[PDB]
Structure 1
């Protein structure tokens, strides 16, 4: 039944400043400003949240190790597993089709 308000300069209900109410060890209710939550990194091909990569603020990534923001597979930390598998399969099939086209062309101008 004790009423609390903002503790900073901004007096408006903006997304920047948001308030939680906590009971301090002094026995009173007090306001506390909450920071914006972090966002999971997303795959660069399909846009789904990357698996096994920590969710932090943009500047909090510079203070953790590489194993907390990467995956041991190729493109790990940038693309998910299915996208990488699709990339591998597509690249191999494209190269095989290029070989087949080159052989067919070598045959078709071999006539003259």
Structure 2
């Protein structure tokens, strides 16, 4: 069976020197150097993969338009839309509780 060689001068099986065997229009087998696979962007709060964000190597994010990199929502391409919902609910409830707390303090400061 047709055997292949590395096409660069790196002769070692490093993770930057990974290949796959392809067949060319010339009918022969050849090595094809494959780049390292990209990691999905993760949420800043929970760490889960962000839905609707393209998976590219970091420099490739400078090539694509904004649509591939964000979602139409607050914290679009940085938080996971359950953490955003949790942020909204926590903010509203704690702000209301702060109003309640200062009303209680103003009430209990009138005891004397």
Deviation, 1:111, is 1.7
Deviation, 1:19, is 1.3
Q: Distance in 2 between matches of 1:68 and 1:23?
A: 32
Provide, for residues 42-92 of structure 1, a one-character-per-residue CA deviation record: whole Å limited to 9, x for no partner: 111011111111111111111111111111111000101110000000011
Q: Which residue of 2 aligns with 1:19?
A: 19
Unaligned runs of 5+ in 2: none
Look up the SS of the partner of 2:22 in the other structure. strand
Unaligned runs of 5+ in 1: none
Q: Distance in 1 between matches of 2:32 and 2:67?
A: 33
Q: Distance in 2 between matches of 1:20 and 1:86?
A: 45
Q: Which residue of 2 aligns with 1:108?
A: 108
Look up the SS of the partner of 1:41 in the other structure. coil
Q: Distance in 1 between matches of 2:30 and 2:52?
A: 37
Provide, for residues 26-53 of structure 1, a one-character-per-residue CA deviation record: whole Å limited to 9, x for no partner: 2211111100111111111011111111
Deviation above 6 Å: which 4+ runs of structure 1? none
If the length of structure 1 is used for normalisation, what is the TM-score?
A: 0.95
If the length of structure 2 is used for normalisation, what is the TM-score?
A: 0.95
